[PDB]
Design a protein around this ligand. Structure first.
Ligand code: K
Ligand code: K
Ligand code: K
Ligand code: K
Ligand code: K
Ligand code: K
Ligand code: K
Ligand code: K
Ligand code: K
Ligand code: MG
Ligand code: MG
Ligand code: MG
Ligand code: MG
Ligand code: MG
Ligand code: MG
Ligand code: MG
Ligand code: MG
Ligand code: MG
Ligand code: MG
Ligand code: MG
Ligand code: MG
Ligand code: MG
Ligand code: MG
Ligand code: MG
Ligand code: MG
Ligand code: MG
Ligand code: MG
Ligand code: MG
Ligand code: MG
Ligand code: MG
Ligand code: MG
Ligand code: MG
Ligand code: MG
Ligand code: MG
Ligand code: MG
Ligand code: MG
Ligand code: MG
Ligand code: MG
Ligand code: MG
Ligand code: MG
Ligand code: MG
Ligand code: MG
Ligand code: MG
Ligand code: MG
Ligand code: MG
Ligand code: MG
Ligand code: MG
Ligand code: MG
Ligand code: MG
Ligand code: MG
Ligand code: MG
Ligand code: MG
Ligand code: MG
Ligand code: MG
Ligand code: MG
Ligand code: MG
Ligand code: MG
Ligand code: MG
Ligand code: MG
Ligand code: MG
Ligand code: MG
Ligand code: MG
Ligand code: MG
Ligand code: MG
Ligand code: MG
Ligand code: MG
Ligand code: MG
Lengths: 393, 240, 49, 46
RNA sequence: ACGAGCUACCCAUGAGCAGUUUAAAAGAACCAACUCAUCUAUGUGGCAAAAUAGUGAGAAGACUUGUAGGUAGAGGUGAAAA
RNA sequence: CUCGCACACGCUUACAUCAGUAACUAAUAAUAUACUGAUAAUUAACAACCAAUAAACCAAAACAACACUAAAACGUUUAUUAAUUACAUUGUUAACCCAACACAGGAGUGCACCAAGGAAAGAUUAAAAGAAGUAAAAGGAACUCGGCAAACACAAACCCCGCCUGUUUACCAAAAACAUCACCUCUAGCAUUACUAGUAUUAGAGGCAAUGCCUGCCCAGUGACACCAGUUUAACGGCCGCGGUAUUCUGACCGUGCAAAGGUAGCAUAAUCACUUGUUCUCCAAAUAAGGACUUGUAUGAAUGGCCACACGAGGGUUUUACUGUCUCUU
RNA sequence: AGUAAGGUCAGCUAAAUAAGCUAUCGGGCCCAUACCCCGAAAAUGUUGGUUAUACCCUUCCCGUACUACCA
């Protein structure tokens, strides 16, 4: 084959030993007595350095198998920055779900009612877009990592103002950079969702189930799509050190034990840095399932069985100009077999909030053609965004 | 002063790697090859020449992979295509009509009768039909592809005698090689690379070629149309 | 042969020039001072492929 | 087109070309130090 | 032996090009910053061991430019002017 | 009248307060940012110093929605480790640096063109000559190598050589020279520092210069290859005499000789030895100039390239129009 | 000016054993001419010297050829 090393770049081999060491029963004469190099004397051979007392920073890194949690079985870990090739298909396969186009009827009918709209909804959202992209920064062209979390927080505040009309939104509270872990066995291989999230919203009361029993029964006959050349594991991180313990982000007795919404933000200036929309939806599927699986096992037990009371977890993905919406319902814990009841997940893809924005007035032939402000606006994207926030109430 | 070559990466990775130009200067620092330097900055893609390479040695059987996308490689004159299978991805040279969402089979099982030749499949020279166009020729078993990799270059298998295959290189020179070497069926992508026309002197500078020297050298005896018989067949088979 | 080559090219130039004057007359008689913007008269009687 | 200002000062370049460390890295450079020490120079090198 | 802090070329790492004309960032066009130095007049121990004044050519590229590194005299380098 | 504040690089107390300058320094005096003596000063938030390994990730910057070709600087997260302990060390002035000078020169980035920074005349007289600027009667290139310079002009056309943008003799030549897209010849079947992390549609050693029509004949010599016969000129190079012949002229033709073949197409008094100011026509009142023809150029000529054309040119030559102290002739 | 260099039948060539081809003259073949076949004649630019001559040298004459440069 063609090994990728290069002789010059690789570390050179140690120089050949002097001929004196090859003569049996002959003590070589070295310069180690004078502790400095001298020509004409044999090069000493020293034993490997053995510091009597270990020092934390300056010691060599311990071997991986020395860690107590090291295990022979190879477990696969999915953190934030893992990319899946068949994002919709791989996430569906690893989770044993069924993709249903469109938001559920409860969510969609919760936004079409005019009695659930903020005052001047069209005007305030228009200012929120302008504030996020042009007003929030002193620079003329704010970078994406500045206006990606601003636009999401601005829209959260708009739907947070509805607490006066619905005095039940006070049961929600936000959490930041929590440690989440959920391990399950999926067809003789071990998977684990470990890492953190951008923003998390929790509510005191659990979210009611959203899928009718007719659809659950129809899910049994559904067959998961498969891809032969690509193994389902591709895109994950193979870790030999892990702990089989589903650990959520909070300890026992937390007054908000029911997660409600997950907010994933792809904030990065460079195009290759950010997730593709197909891969971004995969990121939401697993993390929404990871939070759902943690509750399904904490509230019922480690035993694998079908859940009589489903757990519903929502999540919203944002690019700064394009939005992704996901509502996931968990029904099955015994994921080893593929013949039981599958889960459900409603996904709306590429909900474009606005087409383009002009930070500076474009001038063609000494006249103004398009003034400052967003070009094109679709209020339904925010209307669905408002629907998810008010789903609990 | 001795310099360090930028080819220091040890582990294969599909992502592009940083690349430093040379400009014709050797490690000493003197010009050895003229007319090279001052080109546009480029990144290098790790190309896996060995078509047959199982993920693990537990299952040495033939495996089939899927093509994801076909990209443009600044280094070589051909087009490389991303190929994924199992738990790894590879950059291999794309044939004439390789597109996205295509399946490629890699095999080494030398069957007695035959194997149907597809546009992307890689089979040992012992199983291919006599009249087959091939590229990425492996000179010795396990060495890897070295020959026939430019854009639009395709060699044709000639005959298989006493368990040994003879191929025709693009230079119209016959080459003898053991039939167990892996080869790829088809013609290399970007067929019209020869028909490309450079519109201005600046485009040569963008590619990275410096202008020739202005010294006027009188032609010697080497010049003139030379008619020479074809050299004998080059054989890599070691006769015991 | 080369005497006819000179004349054929000479007649082609006059053929193109006379064609330009015909187009120039059109816009001048229409009241315009300059030819319409974005309009450059092509050289139809020119060797191409 | 107006020569005479060929010396553009730079401490990074001066200490890298005529520094004490470089003088002791090459066998010919050490002989330069030896000659200046024998001659009695006040400043062996920059 | 010592010199690539000027200059010829290259490898790293950075930074500039406003307005105007065009589906054009097209080795296109007008014109500044910027870079070269065509013609003439002063200057000729001069302000200057190659400059000043007027006038000129390019000005989104084979372009200018800072920092730093590499090639050394039987050689280096060169879009050959020995 | 207008190159101003600040940072980087450099210089190294030349900065500040007070006092003195007969003399030293400023090319003079007053005097003190620049000479002498004493005393004093720049305080960190800004800036320098400021973790390692393994793993996942094919998807450009140009308001970036999405694309072009020349394929592009710019990283997050997970895992395993990392002394944990107020106050560390260092750069903070300036009118400054490189050019022998307190030099009309050279000098990167951000923001302004000012709210900031500065003084062309030491005092007189108002000669010549010289330099710079403004205006002019009538004439408008009659000046002169050339319309150089200057101008209330800021246009039009022809030719020669190069196709074009570009490049070169830093300090007498910026061009017709070199480069260049194009075409062609030649050498090479391939691995860990160039060529190349490439593989004959690739890469080197060269020639000639886009495009268009073409690139004729010659391996005897030399060179190269084959390394033998031989093969090669888009390899170096070459590509003919003498005599007679249709009334006269010319020479289709013929005799004879030598050669590896005897200059073919084309163009032409040319940038082309001399003859030369060839001859003729147009342009001018007048033409050693310029353009168009005639043409043995016995020394033009076909990739040491011939020939034609668009565009282009601070190259070289000519003409018309407009302007003007270039000039009649200076004030 | 100097140097180089040649002359041979009517014409052009090779040898100095003055030959070969063609032209010229005579004859044959054909209706006649030409082709063709047969036969004959023909010369060493010029003067002198080269045992004696010729290829040589010299004199005379015609004509051919190269070079005429640095300031
Ligand atoms: K390519
Ligand atoms: K250096
Ligand atoms: K000066
Ligand atoms: K100083
Ligand atoms: K004259
Ligand atoms: K020029
Ligand atoms: K030969
Ligand atoms: K003429
Ligand atoms: K020019
Ligand atoms: Mg390359
Ligand atoms: Mg070339
Ligand atoms: Mg050349
Ligand atoms: Mg000096
Ligand atoms: Mg410099
Ligand atoms: Mg340098
Ligand atoms: Mg511009
Ligand atoms: Mg331009
Ligand atoms: Mg220059
Ligand atoms: Mg000037
Ligand atoms: Mg001037
Ligand atoms: Mg003037
Ligand atoms: Mg200009
Ligand atoms: Mg121009
Ligand atoms: Mg040295
Ligand atoms: Mg040399
Ligand atoms: Mg150059
Ligand atoms: Mg020369
Ligand atoms: Mg010379
Ligand atoms: Mg000094
Ligand atoms: Mg003074
Ligand atoms: Mg004082
Ligand atoms: Mg003082
Ligand atoms: Mg001075
Ligand atoms: Mg003054
Ligand atoms: Mg005075
Ligand atoms: Mg006077
Ligand atoms: Mg005057
Ligand atoms: Mg005037
Ligand atoms: Mg007048
Ligand atoms: Mg005159
Ligand atoms: Mg006169
Ligand atoms: Mg002149
Ligand atoms: Mg002028
Ligand atoms: Mg002429
Ligand atoms: Mg030119
Ligand atoms: Mg021409
Ligand atoms: Mg030019
Ligand atoms: Mg010069
Ligand atoms: Mg000049
Ligand atoms: Mg051709
Ligand atoms: Mg040509
Ligand atoms: Mg040229
Ligand atoms: Mg030429
Ligand atoms: Mg030829
Ligand atoms: Mg031969
Ligand atoms: Mg003619
Ligand atoms: Mg001519
Ligand atoms: Mg002449
Ligand atoms: Mg003249
Ligand atoms: Mg004249
Ligand atoms: Mg003429
Ligand atoms: Mg000639
Ligand atoms: Mg030749
Ligand atoms: Mg010639
Ligand atoms: Mg053109
Ligand atoms: Mg001109
Ligand atoms: Mg006139």
């Amino acid at each position: 084959a063609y090994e990728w090393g290069v002789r010059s770049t690789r570390k050179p081999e140690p120089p050949p030993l002097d001929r004196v060491y090859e003569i049996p029963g002959l003590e070589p004469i070295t310069y180690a007595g004078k502790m400095h190099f001298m020509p004409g004397l044999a090069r000493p051979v020293f034993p490997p350095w053995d510091p009597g007392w270990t020092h934390p920073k300056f010691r060599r890194l311990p071997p991986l198998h020395e860690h107590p949690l090291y295990k022979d079985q190879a477990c696969y870990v999915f953190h934030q920055r893992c990319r899946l090739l068949e994002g919709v298909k791989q996430a569906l396969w690893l989770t044993k779900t069924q993709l249903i186009e469109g938001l559920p009827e409860k969510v969609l009918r919760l936004a079409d009612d005019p009695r659930n709209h903020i005052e001047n909804q069209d005007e305030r959202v228009l200012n929120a877009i302008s504030h996020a992209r042009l007003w929030h920064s002193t620079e003329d062209i704010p970078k994406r990592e500045t206006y990606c979390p601003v636009i999401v927080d601005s829209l959260i505040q708009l739907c947070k103002s509805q607490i006066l009309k619905h005095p039940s939104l006070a049961r929600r509270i936000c959490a930041q950079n929590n440690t989440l872990s959920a391990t399950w066995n999926r067809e003789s291989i071990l998977l684990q969702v470990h890492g953190s999230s951008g923003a998390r919203l929790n509510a005191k009361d659990p979210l009611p189930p959203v899928a009718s029993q007719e659809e659950v029964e129809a899910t049994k006959n559904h067959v998961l799509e498969t891809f032969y050349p690509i193994s389902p594991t591709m895109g994950l991180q193979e870790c030999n050190v892990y702990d089989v313990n589903d650990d959520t982000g909070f300890q026992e007795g937390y007054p908000y034990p029911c997660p409600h919404t997950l907010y994933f933000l792809e904030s990065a200036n460079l195009r290759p840095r950010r997730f593709q929309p197909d891969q971004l939806r995969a990121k939401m599927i697993l993390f929404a399932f990871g939070s759902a699986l943690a509750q399904a096992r904490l509230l019922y037990g480690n035993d694998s069985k079908v859940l009589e009371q489903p757990v519903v977890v929502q999540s919203v993905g944002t690019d700064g100009r394009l939005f992704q919406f996901l509502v996931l319902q968990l029904n099955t814990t015994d994921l080893a077999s593929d013949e039981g009841v599958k889960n459900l997940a409603w996904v709306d893809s590429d909900q474009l909030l606005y087409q383009h924005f002009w930070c500076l007035p474009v001038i063609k032939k000494k006249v103004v053609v398009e003034p400052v402000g967003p070009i094109g606006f679709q209020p339904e994207t925010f209307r669905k965004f408002l629907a998810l926030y008010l789903h609990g109430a | 002063a001795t310099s360090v070559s930028w080819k220091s990466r040890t582990k294969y990775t599909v992502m592009p790697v940083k690349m430093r130009k040379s400009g014709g200067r050797n490690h000493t620092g003197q010009i050895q090859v003229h007319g090279i330097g001052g080109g546009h900055k480029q990144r290098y893609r790790m190309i896996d020449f060995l078509r047959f390479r199982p993920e693990h040695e537990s299952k040495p059987g033939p495996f089939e992979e899927k093509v994801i996308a076909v990209r443009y490689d600044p280094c070589r004159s051909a087009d490389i295509a991303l190929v994924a299978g199992g738990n790894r991805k590879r950059w291999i040279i794309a044939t004439e009509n390789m597109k996205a969402g295509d399946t490629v089979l890699n095999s080494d099982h030398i069957g007695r009768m035959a194997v149907a030749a597809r546009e992307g499949d890689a089979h040992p020279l012992g199983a291919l039909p006599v009249g087959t166009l091939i590229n990425n020729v492996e000179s010795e078993p396990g060495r890897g592809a070295q020959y026939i990799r430019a854009a639009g270059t395709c060699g044709v298998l000639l005959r298989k005698v006493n368990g040994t295959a003879i191929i025709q290189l693009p230079s119209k020179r016959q080459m003898q090689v053991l039939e167990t070497c892996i080869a790829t069926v088809g013609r290399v992508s970007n067929v019209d690379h020869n028909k490309r026309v450079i519109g201005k002197a600046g485009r040569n500078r963008w590619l990275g070629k410096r202008p020739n020297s202005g010294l006027w050298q009188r032609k010697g005896g080497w010049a003139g149309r030379k008619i020479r018989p074809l050299p004998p067949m080059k054989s890599y088979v070691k006769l015991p | 042969r080369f005497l006819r080559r000179k004349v054929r090219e000479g007649r082609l130039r006059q053929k193109q020039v006379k064609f330009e004057r015909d187009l120039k007359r059109i816009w001048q008689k229409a009241g315009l001072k300059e030819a319409p913007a974005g309009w450059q008269t092509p050289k139809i009687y020119l060797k191409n492929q | 087109k107006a020569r005479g200002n060929e010396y553009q000062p730079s401490n990074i370049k001066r200490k890298h070309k005529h520094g004490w460390v470089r003088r002791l890295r090459t066998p010919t450079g050490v002989q330069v130090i030896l000659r200046r020490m024998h001659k009695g120079r006040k400043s062996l090198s920059h």
